[PDB]
Amino acid sequence: ITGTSTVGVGRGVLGDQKNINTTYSTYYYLQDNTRGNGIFTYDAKYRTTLPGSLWADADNQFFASYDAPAVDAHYYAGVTYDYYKNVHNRLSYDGNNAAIRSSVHYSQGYNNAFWNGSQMVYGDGDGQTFIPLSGGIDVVAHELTHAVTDYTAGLIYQNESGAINEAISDIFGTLVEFYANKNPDWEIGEDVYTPGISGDSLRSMSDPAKYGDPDHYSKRYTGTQDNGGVHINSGIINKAAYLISQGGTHYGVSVVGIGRDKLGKIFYRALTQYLTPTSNFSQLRAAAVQSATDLYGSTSQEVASVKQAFDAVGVK
Ligand SMILES: O[C@@H]1[C@@H](O)[C@H](O)OC[C@H]1O
Ligand SMILES: O[C@@H]1[C@@H](O)[C@H](O)OC[C@H]1O
Ligand SMILES: [Ca+2]
Ligand SMILES: [Ca+2]
Ligand SMILES: [Ca+2]
Ligand SMILES: [Ca+2]
Ligand SMILES: [Zn+2]
């Protein structure tokens, strides 16, 4: 909508207070004009029609329980935008400042979030398994990274290319969380997962097996569930990226860590320069090696660590 840019204030899913960029035109809309061609947040009103209504507020103060998921979807979309701009010189997910749209209050008790080819979509959770999922910045960045992947490598969402697609979203969801530096970790979804269970998460990058996911190619799931286990076998790639960044010895294979920022540059380059829609784990390895070579040289520690990490998880 057309209006004058202004700044509102509200509270997130987790009760934290934050300023949000809004637009004034009779009402104050969740429309952030400071980032590319806008970040737009919508209210699905407990239904499944998308995008719904552009969020409209009467006084620019968003402290109601009902507003919190919209506050966080709006705010964390901006953080993810900032990450890709400042770290990877990328303007929005299509690299040309496409408008980022997010709908919250999707359905009733919906325990998920997703990028639907055009926008992000967040359920409220049933209050038991999930609270509103936009409250997890790694969830938001996870979904928005899917838009980045769809516009670049285009990894088919099935089998190994689908698991790479999932791993990429877990990776950059985690790196965006570290970028904001609020209780960051190598776990996925901890902030919105099981409010009644402390210390758990949806997946673990540091130790995929913690939740039954493979941490080695030999343990990969080859059935048909989950489009061939795209959310399961991602553990194999998640573990390799954890090892690249943090180091460790895994099934007796030692990996020297190189840090988070270099992991991001290697995988972003791999994602945008070398991966294709049908790429498999082995081709991901080659992409990661060629990216680290481009960035740091064939005889670098970085290239060596990329090689050690994929050996650890059994990807040749
Ligand atoms: O109480 C809710 C209110 O916060 C919102 O603005 O409109 C829908 C209501 O359910
Ligand atoms: O507020 C209610 C909400 O809790 C539920 O998700 O759907 C029905 C609504 O009236
Ligand atoms: Ca208000
Ligand atoms: Ca965390
Ligand atoms: Ca996390
Ligand atoms: Ca929990
Ligand atoms: Zn995903």
Domains of the chain: which residue ranges?
6-154, 155-315
Method: X-ray
Answer yes or no: is 142 a known binding residue: yes
Residue 114 CA to its chain's centroid (Å):
10
Q: What CATH number does domain 155-315 carry, 1.10.150.530, 1.10.8.290, 1.10.390.10, 3.40.605.10?
A: 1.10.390.10
Q: Is residue 63 within 6 Å of ligand 1 at its C-beta?
A: no
Three-point CA angle 169, 109, 235, nearest 5°: 25
| CATH code of the domain made up of 6-154 | 3.10.170.10
Half-sphere exposure of 162 (CA within 13 A, CB side): 15
Resolution of the determined structure in angstroms stands at 2.0
Tell me the C-alpha distance between 193 and 188, whole Å: 9
Tell me the C-alpha distance between 26 and 58, whole Å: 8
Which atom belonging to ligand 2 lies closest to the Cα atom of 109? 6
Q: Is 295 helix (H, G, I), strand (E, B) or coil?
A: helix
Residue 135 region by backbone torsions, left for phi larger than 0, else alpha for psi between -120 and 50, else beta: alpha
Nearest to 122 by CA among 154, 174, 75, 168: 75
Integer angstrom CA distances of residue 14 from 50, 187, 218 = 25, 18, 39
Half-sphere exposure of 51 (CA within 13 A, CB side): 17
Q: Given ligand 1 and candidates 57, 62, 66, 105, which is best to mutate, with the most ligand atoms within 8 Å of its CB?
A: 66
Q: Whose CA is nearest to atom 7 of ligand 1?
A: 66
The first and second tokens of residue 106, run together, are 């999707």
Half-sphere exposure of 239 (CA within 13 A, CB side): 29
Tell me the C-alpha distance between 206 and 215, whole Å: 9
Q: Is 299 helix (H, G, I), strand (E, B) or coil?
A: coil
Q: Write down the residue that tokens 């290319």 correspond to.
A: 161
Which atom belonging to ligand 1 lies closest to the Cα atom of 67? 4
The first and second tokens of residue 111, run together, are 């325990």
Helices (H), 130-224: 137-150, 159-180
Answer yes or no: is 59 a known binding residue: yes
Residue type, 119: Q
Residues with CB under 5 A from ligand 4 (ion): 183, 185
